[PDB]
# Entry
Amino acid sequence: FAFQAEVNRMMKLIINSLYKNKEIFLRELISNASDALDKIRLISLTDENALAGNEELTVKIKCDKEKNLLHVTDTGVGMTREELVKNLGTIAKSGTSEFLNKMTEAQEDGQSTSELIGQFGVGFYSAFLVADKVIVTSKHNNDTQHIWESDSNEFSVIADPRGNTLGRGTTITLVLKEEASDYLELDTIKNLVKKYSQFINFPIYVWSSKTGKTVWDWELMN
Amino acid sequence: FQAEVNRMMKLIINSLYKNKEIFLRELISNASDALDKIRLISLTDENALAGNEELTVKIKCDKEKNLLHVTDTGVGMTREELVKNLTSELIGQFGVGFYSAFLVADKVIVTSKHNNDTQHIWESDSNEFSVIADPRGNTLGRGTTITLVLKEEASDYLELDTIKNLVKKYSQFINFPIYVWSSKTTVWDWELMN
Ligand SMILES: Nc1ncnc2c1ncn2[C@@H]1O[C@H](COP(=O)(O)OP(=O)(O)O)[C@@H](O)[C@H]1O
Ligand SMILES: Nc1ncnc2c1ncn2[C@@H]1O[C@H](COP(=O)(O)OP(=O)(O)O)[C@@H](O)[C@H]1O
Ligand SMILES: [Mg+2]
Ligand SMILES: [Mg+2]
# Structure
């Protein structure tokens, strides 16, 4: 079961190389954060206690060069354990068996190679254009806080032992590929965030520096 | 088992559908990129276009010799760049990049003249390749001609109307004029497509 994995993994490295502008992954994550915030905002207009777990409605992005991570946190509706498993799990899980079934299916169904490569640049899966691993921490009003992890081959989900630290919402943590180190650069992230947040109805911030000494804090990008 | 994995992927990549016509989209794309590099350069180097004053892409069909020519007056490539700039085959399988030409061609000949070198000819069948200084001298002025020796089954890409429709299809947003050598009611000249 090691050879199939070498073909699976390699197949992805080639398709990723077709994406010169991988920056779209950030547009997709912001779009999902926006959708989650709109959902809880809509709910709050009917239920006065819907925001009890976390009164703010924001998207906050932070870089961690030491750990080589990019965090995109929203205080949207969040996801229950089942949602992490059914929604993200089926989407991210493209291992040996999954990738082949989708291939033959695409083969039979008459799906163009173009239609295939395009699936790599849209939605949640687009995170893998720049990440070796994706970690999702989420808290939905109807469940406890959970952590989901995937390398695009397998995925696991376990209750967060830190308990409810998000209040409500989701953090998408990307363990970036070596060649995606550019997305750990403050100037690049601020530029891209500003680029894709022009239509979201909520404040988006990037953890940035400001200069008695250099202090870091949330900087409004839209 | 690298070659094995490579062979497997190649078999897989081609096990899916893809209109090989996308080769033209890729050639027009490359021509655009080359024209942009020299266009920009001309904004800082007053005489950069001295070798060839126009910024165009001209397509020619040679049914007789079974050849398709895509000539741009872009930046061109030096001898070193032809060897260097021209895995890649896998991407070509996906219908992307220079190597997508082999989807419709048995051999690709590239003639190029860069301001910093003499005109050269690069030839390949996707397995081996050769590069030699053009005996004809500087005939392009500046730029590149991609010459495709079309496969037997790709003979359809030599018909005027066919080529024209294809070019128009993949040149709408290109920042440069694309022409196709065509006849007019016993006249022949370049016809704009975008
Ligand atoms: N930040 C988030 N908060 C809540 N749910 C999310 C988030 N990101 C993704 N999801 C869930 O994952 C699902 C799939 O996301 P995606 O692949 O982008 O497809 P789409 O947005 O078209 O539904 C979303 O529909 C939603 O159910
Ligand atoms: N018409 C052309 N004029 C100058 N250079 C070209 C031309 N076509 C291809 N090249 C060179 O070949 C390289 C590889 O082309 P390609 O496989 O399409 O990849 P890409 O366009 O993404 O760089 C180009 O980057 C360029 O250096
Ligand atoms: Mg989405
Ligand atoms: Mg190209």
Remarks:
- Residues B 26, 30-31, 33-34, 72, 74-75, 77, 85-86, 97-98, 144 surround adenosine-5'-diphosphate (ligand 2) (CB under 6 Å).
- The interface with chain A takes residues 1, 4-5, 8-9, 12-13, 15-19, 22, 87, 90-91, 94-96 of chain B (CB under 8 Å).
- The beta strands of chain B are 57-62, 67-72, 105-113, 120-124, 129-133, 143-150, 178-184, 187-192.
- Residues 17 and 173 of chain B are 25 Å apart (CA to CA).
